[PDB]
């Protein structure tokens, strides 16, 4: 028996759903990844070419919670811009949780904005809420938001 | 497939933590001595995986068994705490007191500073003794809701009550 | 099933080797201006997968991609050097030099005191110019039978043909 | 195509077959390697019970060769007091070898004295002969036998 969490962040950029998205949906961002996000891993391994299928295994530094964990990126629906990545190892999974599941999905707006709607689905066990209740946020996705959007907008 | 790996390279916020003790006590039908020999002996930690069968998915011993060995305990998938480091801070045979810190890992990822065990096995007589088992730790007051629920005597009272067994189970010197 | 890890913890005789070079050119239809351009470029450590495919089993980039950056390289099961570290000891843009040194692991398991890579990109005209790659070694005599049919310019000789490849089907900068 | 080379080593011990085999057969020697050889090793790991299917995988300090191999206990036969061990990754695996085992066999000699005789065989491709000749020798067998036959001894 599990209960299941949702939480969403969306992010509104001056840019076309398909400059975005044609960072989202990149193969070679994932060895990337630490230059979008200086600092944030302490160790970054990429499991595969970075396309559905990839395998990340990330290391944070002493002191963060979780300190490591293994996300798969699952699904990638280009029509409809949006990419599914589940965390498979460590993380949470230690701490009662039975799914995870982050989802993005760039929808337009105008003709040059659209928003990054970012969502994680969660299942855990009730004995569980209390306690990673407070620890999972939308913090993974919003950072990668940010940092997609400055990248495009900036150019 | 290919892997690749990527490795990059507050002064009064870091002690700004509030102290919790929490203890156990087994009082068992053995003598101090007897407890005590299990518990000093050098030889105990490459034995773990043999006293607490199932408990770990991998040990790393760094050391000789005797004070300053450090301890690298990985649990099986689903368990938390997956990985800490502890070492071995004092071994003292004239007052049976063992204190073991955790140095890396576990808790100290979710807010805690500072953890350390400590082990007294007091007789009680002839046949007879406590063994007191203690954890001591420091956490930022933010994180004690997360992190209670979690630090238990556990691994504690379970050494304790496997080592026990042993020796109720009387083998010899 | 159980996995336990136990780990524990000449003056004269440590320079007692004989020094040998060897070197590799390569002379190609590019400029030394867009061949440096890949050799000094500090994305380029993070590409060796896609340059070389199939070279390694696994790759961990320790730093930026600049001088100090420490590349440790894991071959594939048969294949010997198994694993070793090389350290990026100097990009010099305006003699277009560049020095990768051994650090850890393979031919320095094997007699091997030091073990330095040179890499100098030289101009023959406005649209050729020759790769010189060089290894310069310092080994204990006795294991110069053993250790001088291992050590190849292969691996530098590798990068150039790659590098050239990749720079005479010309893309841009 | 390989070359086949057998090489041995033999030591005599004032003890009963059954007194050395009886350290060689046990299934908690594994995890007492470090004792019986102090300073051979940087790091060992035991992946099993110690018996029959025991994996150990075993690095040496930088300077030496092999750096690090993995080992497998195949056999075990009591009566004739044999023992199998094969090399199953990395070490001369790496240099032409195709395979590489270890026997010891324990043969007893008067009612309290053996002799200890270990042998190594390994396959080596024409091209690499030259090679890994000079760095295979007994060594690794002979200090086993020298360790045992000394904590038999001494008592
Ligand atoms: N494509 C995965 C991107 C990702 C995943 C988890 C993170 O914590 C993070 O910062 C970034
Ligand atoms: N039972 C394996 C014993 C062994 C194997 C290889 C060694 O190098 C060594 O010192 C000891
Ligand atoms: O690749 C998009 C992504 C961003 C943050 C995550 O946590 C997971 C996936
Ligand atoms: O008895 C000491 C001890 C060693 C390791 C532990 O995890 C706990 C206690
Ligand atoms: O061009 C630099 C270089 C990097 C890694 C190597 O293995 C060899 C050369
Ligand atoms: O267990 C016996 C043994 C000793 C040395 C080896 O190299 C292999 C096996
Ligand atoms: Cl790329
Ligand atoms: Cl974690
Ligand atoms: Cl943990
Ligand atoms: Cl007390
Ligand atoms: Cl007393
Ligand atoms: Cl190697
Ligand atoms: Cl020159
Ligand atoms: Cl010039
Ligand atoms: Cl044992
Ligand atoms: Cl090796």
């Known amino acids: 028996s599990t209960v299941t969490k949702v939480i969403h962040h969306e992010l509104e950029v001056a840019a076309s759903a398909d400059d975005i998205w044609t960072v989202y949906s990149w193969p070679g961002l994932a060895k990337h990844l630490p230059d979008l996000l200086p600092g944030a891993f302490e160790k970054l391994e990429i499991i595969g070419d970075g396309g559905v299928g990839t395998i990340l295994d990330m290391t944070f530094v002493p002191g ?8 798969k990126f699952i699904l990638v629906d280009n029509e409809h811009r949006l990419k599914k990545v589940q965390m498979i ?10 799914y995870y599941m982050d989802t993005i999905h760039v929808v337009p707006t105008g003709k040059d904005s659209c928003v990054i ?12 809420v209390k306690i990673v209740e407070p620890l999972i946020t939308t ?3 919003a950072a990668m938001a940010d ?6 907008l900036e150019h």
Chains 1, 4 share one sequence.
Do not use: C, R
Request: without cysteine.
């Open 117 to 128: 709607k970012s969502s994680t689905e969660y299942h855990v066990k009730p004995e569980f």
């Open 89 to 98: 190892e460590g993380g949470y999974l230690d701490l009662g949780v039975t």
């Open 147 to 152: 940092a997609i959007s400055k990248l495009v």
């Open 139 to 141: 913090g993974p996705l």
């Open 64 to 71: 963060e919670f979780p300190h490591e964990y293994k996300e």
